């Protein structure tokens, strides 16, 4: 295989590493390298912690962004400081349960897989060892997403070009922390320790917390996601294992591909959006009016009480005739 | 903002207000008045009592139905007789998270705002005050509906209008009501005091009843839905916090817009279809045999057991070409 | 109704009959009979039992597959053997609920009921007695599917004929089996004696299993699913009851109705789909790498631990091209 060879970069999301949507390169092997962590994690305000495994260190790992006919090289890398045997599973690869029969590595071990993207879209990446251990690993934070784009960048299905300004990716995480007698969060002193107890609360489908960047109020404060009015925002949204429903409150997506596949056409004007567990989706908003706006997903009792809110804090010219107080709160007459 | 001015008076649902579909009006100002009304009410046959929170007395709030271009300008009213601050946000609304940073109002007050209608189709609007208020005040009830027409009507996709006969509003609503040590539901004197135990079990994520038109049966016997033989009837469904799957049994949905969105072509010929919680769909069906028929959604336990059934009763003449029993039941030879 | 008969002989799932796609066959009377079976089975690797409700004894029933305008005429048969009255409802069919208005028949009963199909696509079949006792038949096993096909076979939307080589019928079965005060599961010596146990666990919405083709681990070992490289393969699935989010881990949906629907043009490339509780949807994938597969539901916890997998054993060449191990396990530099 004697194409060129492009390294690649990645960053911790919500950010996604430099690239070109339209381009006129061919198809090239795109390196990445993704550095297995295990690690005891704070998840909330409260200070509770989680066993959490992770791709690169984050929750979600970070987005790979590639085009149509590439040939993405991962090494992944397992380094003797973790404790258990992982992998690497990718949706948007062919064969070999998407790399995860040609990915897996004890502590101390590494492995190289190429696979080329002969599908378009937006996919989750996972890890994937065997058996009961396939869940505990994805709802532990191991997980994250692939994109694949058009070499002619992204279009509207009539024709015409969408271009994004900016993308974001935005990683929900369903995550099952056990409680004790008096009903406190429980902590554990390894992952290994955490496995029973966590088990059992999985099996019951029900997640102690709901979080977009590995953690309550990640994308808050100094870390809110931002825009201009003008601004065509891409949000890459993922889901490893559950459901979610996506909504930009006070926006709309102007186009939305939620089962996340670039070869069919977006639909238009959403207010919710829906991720299958297992797959990322995307949507586009063009900002029209400055100001907050919360990203939940809509589940409100997720979202408010369990974790999933992110903010964006958009700046720009207010817009009277989309939106206005007519008259300000005042006393019943 | 210069534009001719038209009062709109709201009918409780599964009814809706008098409207056109295709029209030759340019825009307006359609003016709505929403009264907030905090209550007890009974939710199911064994006389559970619930604490209710609604937009003009009902669950849902009422359906409003105006035009793409339209601006809709709302008083809501919050009288003294309540005990809470209240809000309204709009998912077809644009900025200040869809009204409801510039709607907050405290008991004895009220506000008036006004937003263009730039996106068609069916839509949420919801109560939400700030943090863990929001889930508690939806799934308290305030929750309902907008419809947003393009001002040609309805259209299949391929250049053909689709006219409906009459419309009918199902709000689906999930609630949430503690049971005592016994297994008995619990009774409240207040929203307050309601709100421990409540959150308690809200944070579960399993409801207790699912319901229609706010209560078990609310859509049966005298207050079944009707039609006749060969007239199209739209359905506009709302679940403002949880996922729902609608199904007509012994029919279809003939054209189905389950994300809800009028800028999408509908799907056609569907059983059962799915509506995002946080979001609004349609489905248009001709009815083609009399008798009974049940609209649920189809999670059949929530169906049967915890609320969510409403009945069609329809006239008019068998077709023996589409159905026929033949042969009654007899003993096996 | 004067049109030439044919008998089918039903076989058991995944498998199904014979049929043609494409067809010059005009209408005629299809001819189908199912026999309700009720029995204890074991549905998992322990040993649990379950009192299951069956039609012909397999859960999920047959699979039956018509042409549009089709005349089907069911006899549905109860033996003296069983102890509850029983009916079938048909989402396929129009009017009398489905059917359930016109099949409702005691032990010792057969009744003879016949519906044309005037919709395109897959759709669950099952029983539903009344009120409930819907439910309860429902996730005891009493559900199916049935396939309308165009006469000029699939397309995919743009004028190109869709061909499989081999189909295959996935039902997907939620299991509601209660719990010991030590927490073993329960065995019970009649489905009456189930009831009232089983009936306050399903109000909980949490099943206990989640299987295909009735047991964990069916679609496994010498009952893999079975393909070769280059073999276009359609799979049905269906769920009666609760949603499902279907995955072919190492593959694609390369072209998927998840709403079920012929009218409705295919998706495609897509990672995971998603199945509506109440409905049937199909994908269609062209094998391209040898080896074995997993299909699950892409809610991990339901595969891997609640009993959502099977299997695919295929066999042909390997691609290097699409994907490789480029450097085996190693140890880290
Ligand atoms: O981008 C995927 C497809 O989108 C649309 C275009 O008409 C087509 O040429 C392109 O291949
Ligand atoms: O109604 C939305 C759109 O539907 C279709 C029509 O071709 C288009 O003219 C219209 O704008
Ligand atoms: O198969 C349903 C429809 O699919 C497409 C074809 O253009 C149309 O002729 C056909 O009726
Ligand atoms: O945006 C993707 C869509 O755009 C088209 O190429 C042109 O309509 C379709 O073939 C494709 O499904
Ligand atoms: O029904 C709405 C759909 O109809 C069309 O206008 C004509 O096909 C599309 O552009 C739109 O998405
Ligand atoms: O595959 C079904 C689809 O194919 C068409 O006939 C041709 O595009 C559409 O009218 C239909 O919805
Ligand atoms: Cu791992
Ligand atoms: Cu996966
Ligand atoms: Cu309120
Ligand atoms: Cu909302
Ligand atoms: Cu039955
Ligand atoms: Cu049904």
Same sequence: chains 1, 2, 3.
Avoid at 57 to 76: A, F, I, K, N
Avoid at 158 to 168: I, N, Q, R, S, T
Avoid at 215 to 230: C, D, E, I, R, S
Wanted: net charge negative; proline share 6%.
């Amino acid at each position: 295989l004697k194409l060129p060879r492009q390294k690649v970069e990645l960053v911790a999301p919500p950010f996604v590493h430099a690239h070109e949507q339209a381009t006129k390169q061919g198809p090239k092997i795109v390196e990445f390298k993704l550095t297995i962590e295990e690690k005891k994690v704070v998840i909330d305000e409260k200070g509770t912690t989680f066993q959490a495994m992770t791709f690169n260190g984050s929750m979600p790992g970070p987005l790979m962004v590639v085009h149509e006919g590439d040939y993405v090289e991962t090494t992944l890398v397992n380094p003797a400081t973790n404790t258990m045997p992982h992998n690497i599973d990718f949706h948007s690869a062919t064969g070999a349960l998407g790399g995860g029969a040609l990915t897996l590595i004890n502590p101390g071990e590494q492995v190289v897989l190429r696979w080329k993207a002969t599908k378009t879209g937006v996919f989750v990446y996972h890890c994937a060892p065997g058996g009961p251990m396939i869940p505990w690993h994805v709802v532990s934070g191991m997980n994250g997403a692939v994109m694949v784009l058009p070499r002619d960048g992204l279009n509207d299905g009539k024709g015409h070009a969408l271009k994004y300004d900016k993308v974001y990716y935005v990683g929900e995480q369903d995550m099952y922390v056990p409680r004790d007698e008096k009903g406190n969060f429980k902590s554990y002193d390894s992952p290994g320790e955490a496995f029973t107890d966590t088990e059992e609360m999985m099996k019951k489908l029900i997640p102690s917390h709901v979080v977009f960047n590995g953690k309550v109020g990640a994308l808050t404060g100094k870390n809110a996601l931002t825009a201009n009015v003008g601004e065509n925002v891409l949000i890459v949204h993922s889901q490893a294992n559950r459901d979610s429903r996506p909504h930009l409150i006070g926006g709309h997506g102007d186009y939305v591909w939620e089962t996340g596949k670039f070869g069919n056409a977006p639909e238009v004007g959403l207010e919710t959006w829906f991720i299958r567990g297992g797959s990322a989706g995307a949507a586009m908003y063009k900002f029209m009016q400055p100001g907050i706006y919360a990203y939940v997903t809509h589940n409100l009792i997720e979202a408010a009480d369990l974790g999933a809110t992110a903010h964006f804090k958009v700046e720009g010219k207010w817009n009277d005739d989309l939106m206005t107080q007519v008259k300000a709160p005042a006393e019943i007459p």
